[PDB]
Structure formats: C-alpha cells, structure tokens
Paper text:
To gain insight into the putative active site of Tmm7211, we solved the crystal structure of Tmm7211 to 1.8 Å. The crystals of Tmm7211 belong to the P21 space group, with two molecules arranged as a dimer in an asymmetric unit. Gel filtration analysis indicated that Tmm7211 functions as a dimer in solution, which is supported by the result of the PISA server prediction. After structural refinement, the NADP+ and FAD molecules can be clearly observed in the structure. The overall structure of Tmm7211 is similar to those of other reported bacterial FMOs, with the root mean square deviations (RMSDs) between Tmm7211 and other bacterial FMOs of no more than 0.6 Å. Tmm7211 also comprises an NADPH binding domain and an FAD binding domain. These two domains are connected through two hinge regions (Ser163–Pro168 and Cys268–Leu272). For NADP+ binding, residues Trp70 and Arg409 form hydrogen bonds with the nicotinamide ring, Asn72 and Gln315 interact with the ribose ring via water-mediated hydrogen-bonds, and Tyr170, Ser202, Ser203, Ser205, Arg226, His227, and Asn288 interact with the other parts of NADP+. For FAD binding, residues Asn72 and Thr318 interact with the isoalloxazine ring, Glu37 forms hydrogen bonds with the ribose ring, Val125 forms a hydrogen bond with the adenine moiety, and Gly10, Leu45, Trp46, Gly160, Ser163, and Gln315 interact with the other parts of FAD.
Tmm is a bacterial flavin-containing monooxygenase (FMO), which belongs to the class B flavoprotein monooxygenases. FAD and NADPH molecules are essential for the catalysis of Tmm7211.
Numbering used by the authors:
A (entry chain A): 1 to 444
B (entry chain B): 2 to 441
The structure:
Amino acid sequence: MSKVAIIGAGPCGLSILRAFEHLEKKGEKIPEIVCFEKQESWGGLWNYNWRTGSDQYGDPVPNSMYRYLWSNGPKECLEFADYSFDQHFGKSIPSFPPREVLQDYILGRVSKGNIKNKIKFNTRVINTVYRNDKFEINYQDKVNDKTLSDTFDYLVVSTGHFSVPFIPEYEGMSSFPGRIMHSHDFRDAEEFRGKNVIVLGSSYSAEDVALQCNKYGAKSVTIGYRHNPMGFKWPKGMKEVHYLDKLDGKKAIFKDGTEQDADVVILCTGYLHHFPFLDESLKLKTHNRLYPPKLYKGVVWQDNHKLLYLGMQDQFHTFNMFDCQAWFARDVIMDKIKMPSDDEIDKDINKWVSMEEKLENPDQMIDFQTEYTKELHNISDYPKIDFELIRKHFKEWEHHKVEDILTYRNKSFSSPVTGSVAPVHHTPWEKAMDDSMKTFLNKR
Amino acid sequence: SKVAIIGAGPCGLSILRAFEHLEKKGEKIPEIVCFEKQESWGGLWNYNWRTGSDQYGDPVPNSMYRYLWSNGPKECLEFADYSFDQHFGKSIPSFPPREVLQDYILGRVSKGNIKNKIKFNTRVINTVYRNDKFEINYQDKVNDKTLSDTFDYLVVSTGHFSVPFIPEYEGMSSFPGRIMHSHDFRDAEEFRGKNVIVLGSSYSAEDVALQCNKYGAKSVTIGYRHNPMGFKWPKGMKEVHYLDKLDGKKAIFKDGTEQDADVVILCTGYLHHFPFLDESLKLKTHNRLYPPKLYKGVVWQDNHKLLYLGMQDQFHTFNMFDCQAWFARDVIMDKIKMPSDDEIDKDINKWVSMEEKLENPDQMIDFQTEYTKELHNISDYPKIDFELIRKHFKEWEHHKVEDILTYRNKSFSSPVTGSVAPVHHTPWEKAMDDSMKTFL
Ligand SMILES: Cc1cc2nc3c(=O)[nH]c(=O)nc-3n(C[C@H](O)[C@H](O)[C@H](O)COP(=O)(O)OP(=O)(O)OC[C@H]3O[C@@H](n4cnc5c(N)ncnc54)[C@H](O)[C@@H]3O)c2cc1C
Ligand SMILES: Cc1cc2nc3c(=O)[nH]c(=O)nc-3n(C[C@H](O)[C@H](O)[C@H](O)COP(=O)(O)OP(=O)(O)OC[C@H]3O[C@@H](n4cnc5c(N)ncnc54)[C@H](O)[C@@H]3O)c2cc1C
Ligand SMILES: NC(=O)c1ccc[n+]([C@@H]2O[C@H](COP(=O)([O-])OP(=O)(O)OC[C@H]3O[C@@H](n4cnc5c(N)ncnc54)[C@H](OP(=O)(O)O)[C@@H]3O)[C@@H](O)[C@H]2O)c1
Ligand SMILES: NC(=O)c1ccc[n+]([C@@H]2O[C@H](COP(=O)([O-])OP(=O)(O)OC[C@H]3O[C@@H](n4cnc5c(N)ncnc54)[C@H](OP(=O)(O)O)[C@@H]3O)[C@@H](O)[C@H]2O)c1
C-alpha cells in the first residue's frame, strides 16, 4: 500500500519499473509508482540529443552521448537476463552495436505493458526532504513552468552520474582562440574535420573521443594524461603526451616539452555525482569509484533505509548489474528482504569498501564487480545469467583493447543468457562511418 | 535591518554603491550580504572561457565573447556619480572594448568596503518568505555545502541574459557541425573559413554575424522569422526568411534559400529564470521594456520587500540600474513609502499600457527615458542629462541604419561632464585586438 517515487527513466529507472512489472504480471499487488523524467522520453544517456548545456526551459542537458557512438564493451556483458538479445532481435547480431541498436533493446524490454504510463516526462525533480516518515518532493512541470508537490514512502534515485561534467581550468584558457569543451558537449565529430584536436584525460571518454576525432577526419589528435598514459596502440596521426602546462595561442604546451598546434581542447575529465534536488541529509557525496560508502549492498542509503540509489558505482558491468540492484531494491520496498542491524550494515559496507580500496588493476576490478553483482543476484528473483562467463568476457575484452584499440569492436562474444555466439559484423568498426541501426542490421 | 542582494553584476553593484553613498555621509545603513556565483564581481562584463556549467556543476552565467565591443554609445550608460573623465582622466572614444567598461564598472566600487560584503562562488538556491523574513538557502560551491540565513529585504539582481532560450529546428539531430546558442559564443576565430548560419533578429544576431565575418567566416547567413534587421550587411553576408530545416551541411529556408552550413548559432534570446525563488516571489515574463507586477519596475507587487533590478529589456543600462537602485535603497530605508495597493496597481497599468503601444525604436527610447527620468526624480542620484541621452540613442539608431559597420566609430558627448569623445585611432572593422591596453 506504499507510494514509491523514482527519479530518472534511464536504464536504472527502467530496471526497477521492470522489476515491479514482473511481480504485477504474476498477480502480485504492487505499490503505486511515480517516475519523474526531465527528458521528453525514456532512455537516459542512451538517447541522442543535439542539445548542449541547457534546454529550452533552462534545465541542464543530461545527455552525454555523441553521433557515431558504438558500444564500448561487449554487449553480451550487459544482456538482460529476463529479456535476451535473441528474444529482442530474433537472431544473433554482432557484439559491439551502435548506440541506436542498444537503445532499441533497452526500450523494447519495457514498451509492451503499462510502464510508460507511470512516467511523467519533461518533469524535473527539484527538492526532496524527509519528514514525518515521508519523502516530500517538489518537481517542476517544465512545459507549464510550474512547481508541483507530492509525498512518497520510498524514494529511488536513478539519475546516473555521467551527465554533470567536471571541468578543470588550465593556464591560457582565457586567451585560447579555439573551442574549449567537455566530452559532455561532444556531438558530431565532423565538426573537427581538418582541425588539430587536444584531448585531455585517461579513461573511456578520452579514448573514444580521440578515436572518433581521428576517424572523422581531424588533422591531428594529441592526448594529454596527468598520471599515466592509456598506452593503447594509437593510429598514425595520434599521440599521447604528459600533462598540459598551458595554452599559448593556437599552441598547447605540455610538461614533457611537447608543443602542439591546437584548434580545440576537449576535456574528457569525468563527471560529478550531483544531486541538487536532495536534502543534504539524503545526498550521496562521492567521486567515481566501484564502491562508494554509505550504501548498503551499494543501494540502500545507510542513514535512511527507504532511500535507494541505483547505478551510482563506476561501471564495468552495466545493465544486468542495474537489474540486480533494482530487483534487490524492489524486494526491500516490498519487505521481502529485511534490513539487518545497524552494526551489521556498517560492517558489511566496510567489508566491500576495504576490498574496493585494495583493487589494483582491471582484472581485480572486474573480479570485484562480478562478486558484488553475483551476491546481489543471489538475494533476489532475477533470472539465470552466467556471471562467470561475463567475468571472462571482460578480461578478454581488456586484452583485445591492449592488442589493438582499433579492432576490439570487431570481436565476437557468446551470450551469458542463451549461449548464442555473435557473428562478425559486415563492416569493421574502423571503417563503419554510418552508425544507423538500419545499416547495421541490414546486409551490406 | 538585514538585506540580501543576489548578483554582483552592474545592478547588484549599483545598489551596494547606493548604500555606500549614504554610509560615507555618516548615515547608518543596514547589514548587507551580496551573493555571487562567479569567482569575482562584474556580472556579464566578465569574460569566461567556460560554457554550459562550471567545475561545480553550476550553470555558467557569462554570455560575453572575445573581441566584444560596447554596442551602444558609452555616453548613454555613464554613471552620474562617477564620470568617465574621473575614471580615465582623459576623453576616450564612445565605443570601448569590453575590458574597458568592465574596468570602469569595478573602478566605481573598488575604493571602499563594498567588495568585503560579497560572498563569491556562492549560489543562492532557495528562497521562501515566512514570519516576515526571507529564508534563504545558498550553496557554498567550493565546500559543496548548503548554508542558510534570514533577511528582511531581498534584492534580486541576477540579470536576464544568462539562461538561453534554445529552439529546435528540423534536422538538428543529424546536422554534421556545431549547433550552439549565442550564450556559448567565445572566440570567433573558431569559425574562420566556415559557413555560419545565424538565427535571430536582435542585438546578438547582429553582432555575432558581424564578429564571424570580421574574423574570417567563409560566409554568414542570417535567418529571420518575422522581419529582417535590414542593415547594410558586408559583402559576404545575407539575410533570409525563416529556417525550414537542416539537411546535412545544408540550411534550407522558407524563401527557398539553400545555404552551405558548417555551424548554426541560435541568437534566439534568453529566459527570465529564477529557480531559487518560491513560486509566490518569482517574476515570470518575456523580454520587454516593462513587465507587470513591478511597481516602478522594481518592487514586487505582492511583496514590497522583494525588489528586482534590471529586469526590463534595455536601451538604457548602467544609469537606469542606478536610478532603480537608488529607488530600491530608499524603499529599504523607509524614505520612500509605498502608496496604496490600488494606487500601485493603477500606476503599473499606466506604464504597462504605454509599453504595449510602443511601435518603433524612437518610441521605445522615449518610453525608457521617461521611465528612468521619473525614477531619477524620486531619489538623490546625481545630475545627468537624460534629454541628451535620449537624443544620443536616436542618433545611434540612425548611425546603425546608415552603416552597421561604422556606427562604433562615432563620437558622443558626456551627459555628465559634456566631454566630447575622440574618434578612436582604429576603425572598428579593422580593430582586431580588443585589449584595453592597446585601445587606450
Ligand atoms: C557517453 C557515454 C557512453 C556510454 N557508453 C556505454 C556503453 O557503450 N556501454 C555501456 O554498458 N555503458 C555505457 N555508458 C554507461 C551508462 O552510464 C549506462 O549504460 C547507463 O546509461 C546508466 O543508466 P542510469 O539510468 O543509471 O543513468 P542515466 O542513463 O544517465 O539515466 C538518468 C536519467 O535520469 C534523468 N534525470 C536526471 N536528473 C533528473 C531530475 N532532477 N529529475 C528528473 N529526471 C532526472 C535523466 O534525464 C536521465 O534520463 C555510457 C555512459 C556515457 C556517459
Ligand atoms: C552578450 C551581451 C553583451 C552586452 N553588451 C552590452 C553593451 O555593450 N552595453 C550595454 O550597455 N549593455 C550590454 N549588455 C546588457 C547587460 O545586461 C548589462 O550591461 C549588464 O551586464 C546587466 O547587469 P545585471 O547586474 O542586471 O545582470 P548581470 O550582469 O547578468 O549580473 C547578474 C549576476 O548575478 C549572478 N547570479 C545569477 N544567479 C545567481 C545565484 N543564484 N546566486 C548568486 N549569484 C547569481 C551572476 O553570476 C551575475 O554575475 C549586454 C548583455 C549581453 C548578454
Ligand atoms: N560507448 C563509448 O564509446 C563511450 C564514450 C564516452 C564515455 N563512455 C562512458 O562514459 C563513462 C565515463 O567515462 P569517462 O572517461 O568520461 O569518465 P571517468 O572514467 O570517470 O574518467 C575521468 C578521467 O578524467 C581524468 N581527469 C580527472 N581530472 C582531470 C584533470 N584535471 N585534467 C585531466 N584529466 C583529468 C581522469 O584521469 P587522471 O586523474 O589521471 O587525469 C580520468 O581519466 C564511462 O562509463 C565510460 O564507459 C563510453
Ligand atoms: N555589446 C554587444 O555587441 C552585444 C552582443 C550580443 C548581445 N548584446 C546584448 O544581449 C542582450 C540580449 O540581446 P539578444 O539579441 O540576445 O536577445 P533579444 O533582444 O531578446 O532578442 C531575441 C531574438 O530571438 C529571436 N527569436 C526568438 N525565438 C526565435 C526562434 N524560435 N527562432 C529564431 N529566432 C528567434 C527574436 O526574433 P523573432 O521573434 O522575430 O524570431 C529576437 O530577435 C541585449 O542587451 C543586447 O544588447 C550585446
């Protein structure tokens, strides 16, 4: 008889709506659920949006995906246990599909029944306090420019953590005569054809953005790193150098002495966990990491067990980890899973944080998130899926990237749900200029 | 008595300055706290390379770009209590680059204890009125912490040209180039050799188009929805009717025009945006010379201790903000008494009715002149010749129609000291370096 609020209708918010649907479909009564989504439509980061900065209502644009974006990990690692690739597509498809394809898969899982009607779109949650055993929530109806209010027994935060950019300042930016942007701003790589591009950062965004710039015709691409280089086998017109010292006109100067003509600087420097719409007492504060503290099983807010965060960990696993988290959260809301004592909660949190701090390389991290996810998987209803296969897949994928960063997307992996082997795509990724679902799925 | 001011741009600084005049004379003044989300005072007059949102996730309020020059005669915006002659110590041309006017603005408030009243990197986030106090929450950005305090009076001076209005046009989802708003514009060199599309029909469209051309754009094409600006555009520039869609690197207009396009710059205006005010306190309006619900254009009709500065559309700027500020100060000080609710409503209607009838720039200049002159006579802001200013604006509009490329080369006389501006050593079209250093 509870009333449940969900903030965000991306993969995480959809995971929990889906978790609740499984129960309703079996005949179980479920709580009233309201899901707030600031975008026009569901899909979260998987929606492409030309917009940058803030929208027509002055709401910051949560979209970070760009044109020509392809799955950066094996799709088999993110398959839904309750909704297989074979079921959705009706045939086996390659392991690294373009964004539109995976978006289609995400929305397909939830588009058959009553989930969509539970979501309020163009609606931005702006304020949350907890009082008298209820979450009092203010939200903006954007189209009408109006503040609305309601009260809930449980609150699920699924707003992701890759939308609000962290944007550091370097010397000389005030006088740089080119574009300075964050990866969050990146939209169509053709913008930089024939240009000298500087990329700053050492993770997935730096890696992929650098490659897209080169692929879509940049004159040069130079990656700066602060601590250690990615060390991948970069294409001809690409180099990796240490630490940007300053910009001096159309000239980037690095600490290792490198001087590079620069037309654009793309800061691929990460994002903030940003929750301006939550009271300070409810607000998770953390940098991007595999296991932030104060989250029992990485989900339940330690100080308020009716506040549940989804997807807030750094990610190797994605979709099916979100599912495992969501099924867990559903079961907490349903009172199927009972919270242990305060001391046992704190002890369990410390166990995972301590392991997390000790992680030293991707193999250890992959093992860590595997064990985290598998433990979640065993406490609830989420269907059979082979996390051991997934563990192996991730490690193979890391090896592929080291082997050849240009060709890792051409590899084939087997489904941890159905066993199906992905066919090799008709077009090598390094030559695949058209990112449409149509050309991917059609022959030739 | 305790007063909060939100924003330390020209308007917030105008009121801090108004209160300072009194304190300097020996009058006791209220405790004043001014919140500013930027690192430093100056408002829009600060250049910031950042776009979108900052390192703390706070939307960037800066909209000015590199190579920006004053777009109206500086003699129309001179401070009555701090002349250009006083500040610069010699006559200088009428259209200075941004840094020059920024230096003038901050110079007026630099000498005293005003700066110490301002909390920087501090963003007001919530405002409610209860028990006769404004309860205000603000984020200390650097520490990522929410702080709270209570005030008797609230002055909102956060401008209205920071949060962009950004309309969608068919084809944007697949356009192979940059789509941006003028609010994003930073350095025109970014577009050298590029086919630029500019959408809009006001000051941002006009100046951005010219900046792109001046800094080597291969072409510039301006789309208008209702009416063209009609200025005498430079050789490589044209003005066409209504963008229909983008189809690849192709901009297609309703009048059939097809134009090669590498970048689309939406110069489509800004929102009055106050997420940090309770719905009951929040001004809702489009850009216009006289929004309703603002007594003398300043006092919130439904709460006479909430005062908005600078929220009108602008011909006048600095010295109008001043007149509004001196007014607001005197209201806060209880020198000026509010009239009855009915006389307030009648007075607002009087000005709104006039504002709705304005038909052309001349009538608008006359309107804002009268609005400003009336404010001027209710307080003690010093002598300044608004009649001369009225004339200057009309002359400037004429200059723009005559030649949009040369209007900044014109000279105007100070309405404060009578000083005649010298013609700058370099014509605007050829003035590439916007540094105050090289200007002076
Ligand atoms: C550029 C990029 C590429 C990526 N590529 C891959 C990939 O190839 N493979 C992979 O497995 N993972 C990828 N990821 C990881 C990605 O985070 C997850 O796949 C997934 O999108 C996370 O889903 P989520 O629901 O947790 O957050 P999101 O997908 O960000 O969804 C959050 C939703 O909440 C909404 N929201 C936010 N604030 C509010 C508010 N105040 N009120 C109402 N609604 C709000 C947002 O509009 C958004 O729709 C990528 C991430 C990024 C940024
Ligand atoms: C691109 C551009 C060019 C212009 N050029 C000219 C010109 O040449 N001549 C001319 O006369 N006028 C010009 N103007 C008009 C301009 O509005 C005024 O000159 C003046 O800047 C207005 O000052 P203001 O204090 O009212 O607003 P602003 O200058 O915008 O100051 C508002 C301040 O409030 C702060 N703020 C906002 N929200 C918050 C919050 N929640 N908490 C704390 N602080 C906050 C902002 O950081 C900002 O510093 C221009 C405007 C623009 C946009
Ligand atoms: N499907 C795709 O192809 C694709 C493309 C983009 C993003 N993604 C996803 O988007 C999510 C986020 O990845 P991300 O790379 O953007 O974030 P991230 O993994 O959190 O990495 C942040 C990077 O910023 C660097 N950094 C921090 N401060 C810096 C500074 N002051 N100067 C320079 N560098 C700085 C960090 O390295 P240092 O501290 O050593 O400098 C780090 O490498 C991930 O899920 C990723 O998979 C996928
Ligand atoms: N010193 C300088 O050189 C400098 C440079 C830039 C800005 N400024 C200042 O910035 C402030 C704002 O000027 P502004 O021009 O940005 O704002 P503005 O005066 O409010 O004008 C907004 C423009 O947007 C247009 N518009 C609205 N909706 C549109 C749509 N859907 N598609 C296309 N156009 C649309 C409007 O024309 P339609 O409705 O007819 O389309 C209008 O011309 C002013 O104070 C100005 O002085 C000064």
